[PDB]
Structures are given as structure tokens and as C-alpha cells.
Design a protein around this nucleic acid. Sequence first.
RNA 1: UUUUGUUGGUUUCUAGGACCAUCGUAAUGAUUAAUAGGGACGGUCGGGGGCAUCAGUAUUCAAUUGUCAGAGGUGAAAUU
Length: 127
Amino acid sequence: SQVFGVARIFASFNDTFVHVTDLSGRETIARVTGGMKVKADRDESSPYAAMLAAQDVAAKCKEVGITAVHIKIRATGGTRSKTPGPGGQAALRALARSGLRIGRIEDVTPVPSDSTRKKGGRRGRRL
RNA sequence: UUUUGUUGGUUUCUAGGACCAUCGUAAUGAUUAAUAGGGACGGUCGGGGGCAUCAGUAUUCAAUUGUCAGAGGUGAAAUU
Ligand SMILES: [Mg+2]
């Protein structure tokens, strides 16, 4: 009965994605991003924008013909953060509100075994 | 060297060297085995070293793959 997707929320700092796909992954549905719904450069990762994006994605899904999703969350990963952004949670909330159903939530952030050299240099990033 | 008369011997008796035998004598002869050290032995221990392979991969470029407005980046903010 329930037609599924995989939500894929790439929640980096300074932008969020919501990238709904089929179960194989190849054929997408909607790729809606934070910077797409709020033209302010700053307001990309910002929650409201993320929420809007999520809503848009949901709408797209509805148009297509899908009922449920599998939340996968990706923080920037590897050389950066490994910390889910400000607007992943917000996006999720938005999705929930939309009524597009939810099943099996994961964080598939690519946390390495032993990364190749990080940002900054040795003395780091000195504001 | 001392007497055989005194020189040149030769061999003694002998008294002092020295050197291999064999007989005896004696309680016949190696201090400890350092909570020093070395070394053997025994089971072990270890991200100790060398050489050899395996993973995670992770990033990147590229390949094929999909989807049409921005994604990167921000320190508050921008460029890019
Ligand atoms: Mg490069």
C-alpha cells in the first residue's frame, strides 16, 4: 500500500538539502535546498528556509505519487564537522507536518576511518 | 777449594749450585656465590624496530548514472 522513498537530508552548516529518491537511489523525486527557497545568502541553513524546502519536496512527492519516506541524514562529513546542521531537524519536522509518512530513520554521515588531512593547518582557523 | 812436594791434567772422596725422576709427609691446594653484573633455561608480555599484506576508506579527478537553479564559502558579513 505505502509507496516509499528515501528522504536524504544533507544538513551541512551554511545549507540544507532535502533529496527524496527511490530505494535503489538512482531515480530522484525532488532535490529541494535551503538556498533555493530563501534568497539571502546567509539564510540557507537557517531553519525556516529548510522547512520551506522540505514542504516543497513533500509537495513534489505528492504530485508524483509517493506516500512514505526513509529519513537518511548526512552531515558534511570527513574533512568537515560530522555534526548535523541547524536545519536537518527543522526539515524533518516540516516533513512530519506535511503528512508524508516516515519509516526507518538513520544518520549516514560518512564518518571515516582515519581521515585524509583536515582544514586549517596545524595552528587551525584563527578568527 | 783443600790436602796428595809444585805446575798441567784425569777421576775421586766430598761440600755448595742448578735440573728432570720416583718415595714419602700433610686436613695436601678453589672464600663468598653481593636483593652486584653477565650468560643459558622457562613461560610470557608489548601502539618496541625492519621487511610483507589487509581494511575503513576518505577525500579528488575521471567514467557511466540520474534529476533543471543555483551549490561553495562566511565571523558576524560579503566575494568567489
Ligand atoms: Mg584539486
